[PDB]
């Protein structure tokens, strides 16, 4: 249990080994959640990458934010997947926030502090509590089957998970860096382990 | 009668069922009005959508703001229709305000807080008091004949209707979120009912 505030996970090599298994006390399968994270990578104009990965023994990509190469942010829940069109991707750190829910399938994918229009996904679906959250790898199984092409080779931090859809003002505040209580997983109270050549050093973004 | 401030209607699926019938105490056929609403959707670059719909037993689109696909905002009054050219539509929430009047046919279509040049429409025409205001559907009848292609699949809120053309400073204030008295229909004092898969949750836009 380490506080990662003002620090980010160093992802500098494309590989199937670089990753970080983020532990979470989550026990009840999530009927609603929100993952916020400030990441930064220049692979946006070279290939896609797993921005954030969440697996289950049933679903390898139970919750996964990925850079659809040449199309923006593909966010997936429970295998099913939706896509947020990024008209132009800039070389600059970006703070994403996706807020899928299991009733209305609603996803407030706040990007760089700005909102992406809510779109249905996996409506009335329960996210498996047991998870092998990982970064840098689109896991095709529970923390396994990693691919460099699908890997993040930049850096990422502020990874916070809530069991509820944060209010838009709350998401704004997460962007502003104010306090929060990410019950499911919290960057400032983050339990995790590192595998491969992933380091960890002070986050670039403000 | 529910206050929808800081909340928006969740429109996440293209369908002819998703809609919200907004009740209004309006009794005298409107010789002048103004609808302001902050909506957000990415269909702007995929197809058109009914941003706001207002029907009568005589006219199905008695008052209707729609996204003319590849041409901006088509605003219609009493069947007749005018079009505001949007040179480029950005993925971002926008606050529209149209102000048709029955004497000069004038329409101050304030968009994103900025004005669209006044243009005549339906001059000397009375808007039917009885209405089946709906969102997400270009109704070809009184609250009926909905089409997914003509449907809004984003979200919308701050839907306020006045029986008078608000002063431009007043419209600015509506954009700023200050207080107002939308006699005809008021988001903060909104009477309505929901049909289809439309949810309602905290509005994304500031």
């Amino acid at each position, epitope marked *: 249990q380490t506080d990662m505030s003002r620090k980010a996970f160093v992802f500098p090599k494309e590989s199937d080994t670089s990753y970080v298994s983020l532990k979470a006390p989550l026990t009840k399968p999530l009927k609603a959640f929100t993952v916020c994270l400030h990441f930064y990578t220049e692979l946006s104009s070279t290939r896609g990458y797993s921005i954030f990965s969440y697996a289950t023994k049933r679903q390898d990509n139970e919750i996964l934010i990925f850079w659809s190469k040449d199309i923006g942010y*593909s966010f997936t829940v429970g295998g099913s997947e939706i896509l947020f069109e990024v008209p132009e991707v800039t070389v600059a750190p970006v703070h994403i926030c996706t807020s899928w829910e299991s009733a209305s399938g609603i996803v407030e994918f706040w990007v760089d502090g700005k909102p992406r229009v809510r779109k249905s996904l996996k409506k009335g679906y329960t996210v498996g509590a047991e998870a092998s959250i990982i970064l840098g790898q689109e896991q095709d199984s529970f923390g396994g089957n990693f691919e460099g092409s699908q890997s993040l080779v930049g850096d990422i931090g502020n990874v916070n998970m809530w069991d509820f859809v944060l209010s838009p003002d709350e998401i704004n505040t997460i962007y502003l860096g104010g306090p929060f209580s990410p019950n499911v997983l919290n960057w400032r109270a983050l339990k995790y382990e590192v595998q491969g050549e992933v380091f960890t050093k002070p986050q670039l973004w403000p | 009668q529910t206050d929808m401030s800081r909340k928006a209607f969740v429109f996440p699926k293209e369908s002819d069922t998703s809609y919200v019938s907004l009740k209004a105490p309006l009794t005298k056929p409107l010789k002048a009005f103004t609808v302001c609403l902050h909506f957000y959707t990415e269909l702007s670059s995929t*197809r058109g959508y009914s941003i706001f719909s207002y029907a009568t037993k005589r006219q199905d689109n008695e008052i209707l703001i729609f996204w003319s696909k590849d041409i901006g905002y088509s605003f219609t009054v009493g069947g007749s229709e005018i079009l505001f050219e949007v040179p480029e539509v950005t993925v971002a929430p926008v606050h529209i305000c149209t102000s048709w009047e029955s004497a000069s046919g004038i329409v101050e279509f304030w968009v994103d807080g900025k004005p669209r040049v006044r243009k005549s429409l339906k001059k000397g025409y009375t808007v039917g008091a009885e209405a089946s205001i709906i969102l997400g559907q270009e109704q070809d009848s009184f609250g009926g004949n909905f089409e997914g292609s003509q449907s809004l699949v984003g979200d919308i809120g701050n839907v306020n209707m006045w029986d008078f053309v608000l002063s431009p400073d007043e419209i600015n204030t509506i954009y700023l979120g200050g207080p107002f008295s939308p006699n005809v229909l008021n988001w903060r004092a909104l009477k309505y009912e929901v049909q289809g898969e439309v949810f309602t949750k905290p509005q994304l836009w500031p």
Partner: nanobody
Framework: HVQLVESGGGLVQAGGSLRLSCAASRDIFSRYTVGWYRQAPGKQRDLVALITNGGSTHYVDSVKGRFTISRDNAKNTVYLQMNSLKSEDTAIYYC??????????????WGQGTLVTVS
């Protein structure tokens, strides 16, 4: 056995509309992010468009607005409405089903395609 249905093709005068079908055995397309590729003669196996499992869709710049791909989950018959078919569009359209949206290049199950002639 997958045998992506390739139908709804034929001859259409340029800038018209034609409904391409994409039916799936069982419910497979539910997990697949299915996509239409244009294998035009002397041309590539490039994707004209694609649609995510959830329902969101993308169309390549050359096809922006040109066509609209939707997921028909009732029978796995994802439909593709082609509007304003310019001559370039003339090609054989391969409706393939890869699994997730990021991995456009993989195709897994392969079909036969449907011809399109823009006159």
């Amino acid at each position: 056995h997958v045998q992506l249905v390739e139908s709804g093709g034929g001859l259409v005068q340029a800038g018209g509309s034609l409904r391409l079908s994409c039916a799936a055995s069982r419910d497979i397309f539910s997990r697949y992010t299915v996509g239409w590729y244009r294998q035009a003669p002397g041309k590539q196996r490039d994707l004209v468009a694609l649609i995510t499992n959830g329902g969101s869709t993308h169309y390549v710049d050359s096809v922006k607005g040109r066509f609209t791909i939707s997921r028909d989950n009732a029978k796995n018959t994802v439909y593709l409405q082609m509007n304003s078919l310019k001559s370039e569009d003339t090609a054989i359209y391969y409706c393939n089903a890869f699994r997730a949206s990021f991995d456009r290049t993989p195709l897994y199950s392969w079909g036969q395609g449907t011809l399109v002639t823009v006159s």
